[PDB]
Ligand binder design. Structure first.
Ligand SMILES: COc1cc2c(cc1-c1c(C)noc1C)ncc1[nH]c(=O)n([C@H](C)c3ccccn3)c12
Ligand SMILES: [Cl-]
Ligand SMILES: [K+]
Length: 110
């Protein structure tokens, strides 16, 4: 085995769990400026699961912790953009509380 701090398939398993648990699909794709024009004025450092998947497959995440950090940013961004108590915010809060366990479930070191 490679015995290393980047585990590509483990990171993809992590993203697959996040994807599947994202019932609103609110994390699935980058936000189009034409569809939701205010988003980019509120969220200046966007990230989404498709972009994270692209990065994992390309190798442009150094380590599994870097993937975890981008998922944390993804969640924080959704908590910023959406209003407390909204369905979106509820889902993002659920992710905040569980994403590290999802990483562990996937085989990553947290
Ligand atoms: C991707 O489309 C949206 C995403 C929204 C949204 C409204 C739209 C939307 C839709 C759908 N049709 O017109 C508009 C405007 N309003 C709030 C909100 N909060 C939020 O996190 N999103 C994300 C990006 C999203 C993506 C896909 C499905 C559901 N939600 C959204
Ligand atoms: Cl609010
Ligand atoms: K908010």
């Amino acid at each position: 085995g490679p015995h290393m701090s980047f585990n590509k398939n483990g990171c993809l398993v992590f993203v697959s769990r996040l994807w599947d648990l994202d019932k609103l699909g609110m994390f699935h794709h980058p936000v189009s400026a034409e569809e939701l024009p205010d988003y980019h004025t509120v969220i200046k450092r966007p990230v989404d699961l498709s972009s994270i998947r692209d990065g994992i497959e390309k190798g442009t995440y150094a380590t599994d912790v870097d993937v975890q950090n981008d998922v944390a940013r993804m969640i924080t961004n959704a908590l910023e953009y959406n209003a407390k108590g909204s369905t979106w915010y509820q889902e993002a809060m659920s992710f905040r509380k569980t994403y590290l366990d999802l990483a562990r479930q996937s085989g990553l070191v947290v």
